[PDB]
Symmetry: D2
Subunit: 314 residues, 4 copies
């Protein structure tokens, strides 16, 4: 029972034509529907539900909400009682609040982000089918991202004021949603302060992650790639589209995943994440990264924490 | 709760010196202990428990038993009641039956194979540690296999006699151990007969798999590799050790995983399995492979079902 | 001065529609022209001359002739005098004998194959241009082969009758065309008989190669790929087109190149050759492969000389 | 006849122990000899001559000289007459001027760099041999660089003063040493000024290259890697040794080669260059890169010319 994976992310974009061009040409997604309000919904080729990305017209960038899919409809009631016992108020938007989407349990994380849980979304199938399917589909576009993999949220953190929503989010998703912690960045005196956590429901290194910041926001949403070679191909695609690259191809110390950071035409950061990294397990010890090696935990090859990583978000 | 992953596999070897040489030099495992009976225990570098391979002196090849790790000790009692309600008798070997191994729930699958469930095994840690760890360890040997990934069992099947232990094993591990079916090979009239199934507890395409055969035996145990390039490196290692290769580097249609089939110095087949393939999910539709494309489901590149795949096992 | 690289290969095909489909869909070539006689000319994306493959309607498979490009027009006269001093008669087909092709020096190798040398062919340019070009072109098809890389000729060999056209071809292209020998397979007593030679004009392991056989024929023409990953992608393409694969992805012991052997719809063998292998140099010692390791020289991963390699050619 | 490839590069290092540690542990070279003056000579595993790197104790970084190997001893006299007719004075250091090195033709390029040509250097062979050799050697260290691939020289350039040693070096190595130009960066009004040139003797995109600068110096010496995956492995090695990385893994627009820029413990820049890129040919059109796309020619993925590329050299 419970959460299966990340379901979709709703982003604010300032130019819908350019944003749809970016997520279709660079990452290889397909527009699946547009509702009466101009919101655009997109999915990756190796996803089977209707959409994993919502683009909403706005005056600014940023994230509206973040959604995770649960196994069955009855999970929402059980998780709702666990969440509300913890002290977080929930509400239940019923079927059709979003198009092709069942009812959704809605609540705010301690960091202030809106999170939704749904059990039902319209099935459309992957772009390779499920009867004698090919490993990849013909006519893939751009980077050919498999699926929306995870999301990193910037969480308000002020240790001198006693505020650490990374720690409160980590305790919330573990005790209420039964995520398990895979890796953590420990800063402060002797690593006594959680500044970055990576948690999972799948057996991948992370499906959600929290990083500390002055305010709460969206650091990036990530899309899965198979291999290091696909990261090279994805980097070539971004050059052909003059995509503004935040971080050139390298490897993360955390999760061991190979990565590229880049921006959409509204400022939202995206990531092409490559490789399984390792099989995350509930009996696996939590990988601890210390403050003296803070740069190697994020950008392993250089050991150099980019100022853009900890200063630019939406 | 319940099963986490494959725990270890106990194999029969006829030359212990040569078998240990093979699993250390070719696959890159390390011998962790040898008990008073001459049994040798080995682990991969990206595993943290004491051992994932047992080599036992024998007059023949084959598999002794297959073990899976569960999350907590209390899972064994709950799973024991589920298994025994289904009709399978179980027994409980207590701590120390195997060295550095907790108590084990022991039972036979419908196919006749002995399966064990344990919650506790001595922790030793991965070869890269858990404090600011490197992505890979220095001084890796051979193929540098990450971990024991899965096991494919040959299961007695006789449709004209009404015998299909692949179907009975599939129903058993789903209803009792809460595995979920990811892919299946359907043969017979209109694909009405399950001849090969792939089931998972992790979010990888399979942790266990059953293939039909005249008798029940071991088809292969598999070890995980990161990328297609590592399959090339692994193939070079097998050439340097004159390993007898069953199937040269290619891709599986099922799981999309890139693979090599090769034998140990006793005849047991091993596999170097590369890539995640896809994120297995309980809401994902079961990939069905039909009998007309039976060759592409196993060896995707050629569409040619090797006679060795369906004729050679131990 | 002298030969630069392989220029084109003229093949006999029995079904022109199917052969053009194969070389366009599988290898990614483009049809550039068709002459009044129905001959079809094709080029790869990373070639700049008009064509590197000629498909001629025929009752059988096989090779018509093999062409190499020289640096300048005056090279033909100088090479003609060297060839005719050696004892081989030459002729000069003038401009337009083939469409978009300058004059051609025509002669027969000792093995009986017809070889042509030309200095001029119509320039069309690569599919990425030469002003701020992309590393690869958008809309590549199939395997996306870079260029016609080399050709392996089967050469009549009968040591008990004193016939070895592999040795005579090797001495001819070295003494007359100034190729240099990179690797050789030595069989017979103590490796006293050249059964396979690899010779180069570029600094790649081979631009031409000769292998012994009962008769003289075409073993395969090869096309260059970048990496091992592209060999995986090429193998996936052959599966999607149900291409009959001769040899699944593996590595050659000679040249160190990763490879796939496959057939066109007429029986002619093709190869997708990946990697530089090494920088061939005239001061580099000739790599010698002995008869006891004959299988590893061809198919390095298995050490198993496929019967198809030495028995099937056109 | 003439130049075959780059032969060796003599570098100034300020800490010999640390420099030897770097070139052995990071790039995987082996120390082959040390002369009476403390100079250390190193070679890569896929080279067969005695050394390709000279480390000389000095108070500063920088390059002493650059050496290229010619095919035969008589080439030195012929090239000497061509060079001296052009207007450059030469001298001939005889055998043993450098240990295990034949006589050397010595002269200065128009940019002021000292270049040497030799025909004879002590043969030691590659680390895999030449009789049934493995594709790679067991016990490779670090990145496992194949060979010294090329060298990029910073050349004094002052267009308002009428000084462009990149253009004078390009004309010199073409007219005297018979290099051929593969790619060029054109700046100034309408691309009328050569600011960067890439020239070759092999059929690889470049064996020497010149880039304009305020003074003449050494930009980097490069070492060849096979694939993009090896660049990932090389980047992991630099992290394990806390190598100061200039440019993280990316692709060059010129040559299409994948690359990493990093420094030795004296400040000299090194490069791990991956891939053939393309087959350089004397009939291939020169790839022209314009000033508006100057960033994409160097760092293709970002289109962002690093300030370090054009500001840091020794
Ligand atoms: C440090 C890190 C690891 C993995 C990620 O996906 C990411 O965004 C950051
Ligand atoms: C068909 C198949 C797919 C994946 C495997 O690991 C395997 O052994 C077989
Ligand atoms: C033995 C070998 C090596 C390289 C080739 O291209 C080939 O066809 C055969
Ligand atoms: C632009 C460029 C291309 C290739 C190289 O090796 C290099 O140093 C620079
Ligand atoms: Ca994930
Ligand atoms: Ca698995
Ligand atoms: Ca070639
Ligand atoms: Ca070169
Ligand atoms: Fe991420
Ligand atoms: Fe398997
Ligand atoms: Fe070939
Ligand atoms: Fe370079």
């Amino acid at each position: 029972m419970g959460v299966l994976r990340i379901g979709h992310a709703s982003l604010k974009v300032m130019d819908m034509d350019a944003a749809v061009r970016h997520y279709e040409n660079v990452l290889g997604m397909k527009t699946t529907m547009k509702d009466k309000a101009g919101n655009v919904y997109l999915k990756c080729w190796d996803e089977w539900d209707k959409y994993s990305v919502i683009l909403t017209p706005s005056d600014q960038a940023g994230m509206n909400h973040l959604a995770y899919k649960v196994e069955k409809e009855a999970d929402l009631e059980a998780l709702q009682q666990k969440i509300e016992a913890w002290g977080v108020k929930t509400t239940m938007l019923d079927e059709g609040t979003l198009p092709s989407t069942g009812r959704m349990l809605q609540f705010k994380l301690p960091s202030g982000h809106e999170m939704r849980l749904y059990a039902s979304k319209e099935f459309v199938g992957t772009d390779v089918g499920n009867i004698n399917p090919d490993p990849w589909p013909d006519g893939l576009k751009g980077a050919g991202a498999h699926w929306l993999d995870h999301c990193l949220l910037v969480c308000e953190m002020n240790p001198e004021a006693g505020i650490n929503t990374v720690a409160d989010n980590t305790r919330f998703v573990t005790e209420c949603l039964d995520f398990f912690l895979t890796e953590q960045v420990l800063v402060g005196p002797g690593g006594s302060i959680q500044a970055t956590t990576f948690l999972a429901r799948t057996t991948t290194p992370h499906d959600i992650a929290f990083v500390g910041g002055p305010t709460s926001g969206l650091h990036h949403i990530a899309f899965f790639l198979d291999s290091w070679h696909d990261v090279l191909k994805a980097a070539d695609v971004m050059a052909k589209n003059k995509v503004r690259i935040d971080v050139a191809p390298t490897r993360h110390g955390i999760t061991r995943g190979e990565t590229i950071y880049f921006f959409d035409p509204s400022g939202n950061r995206n990531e092409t994440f490559a490789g399984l990294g390792y099989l995350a397990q509930r009996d696996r010890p939590v990988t601890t990264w210390t403050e003296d090696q803070l740069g190697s935990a994020i950008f392993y090859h250089t050991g150099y924490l980019e100022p853009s990583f900890t200063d630019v978000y939406t």
